[PDB]
Amino acid sequence: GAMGSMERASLIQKAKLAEQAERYEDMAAFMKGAVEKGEELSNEERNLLSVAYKNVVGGQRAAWRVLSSIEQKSNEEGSEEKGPEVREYREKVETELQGVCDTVLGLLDSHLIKEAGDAESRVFYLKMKGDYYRYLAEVATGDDKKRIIDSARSAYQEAMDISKKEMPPTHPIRLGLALNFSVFHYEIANSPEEAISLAKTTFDEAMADLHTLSEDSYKDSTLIMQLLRDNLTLWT
């Protein structure tokens, strides 16, 4: 593509530099170029790909929420007619966010998921698939909203099924997947009970397997376990 003439290793080196410079749009474009080289990603490279886009879409989502909240206030009784600008600009931000999601989903479908045979790669990509459909669902308001939602559910559920069969209950990818699937239940699928049960059960099964870990793996798992606990505290 745009990154067609750059060496794969140079793209990776540059993605790491853009991360250090907090240049996440650049980071993401370098990683998209690396994926498009056609070779599978290593563990480190999957982590770079995920960080790049999560940061980019995370800035777009925060912006969309600011603008959506302004837009709703302007639609309240007694608010003065501001004209079309707030809706137009929210739509602009929304469209760009949707294009980022479509780009990630594109990479996963062409051809990351189909070549991912190990549990750690396959679950990682399926979690990303559920995440980007979930970001689409956050902004969806039309006839496709139910289908977007259930594409998020189906990707998360396939990732859960594999992670349960193939990964220990403390694996960070298993834990991060459950945390996000649990947020999907709470916030997207209007199933706060399912959200809470999943976060509880995931946390308790991780607790009971901590004993098997080195001190460095202990540190990695308890970090995400803490985020499960934060949501349980907020939700109960």
Binding site: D131, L179, N180, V183, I224, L228
Partner: peptide
């Protein structure tokens, strides 16, 4: 305040 995701 805002729920956590990762």
């Amino acid at each position: 305040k805002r729920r956590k995701s990762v």
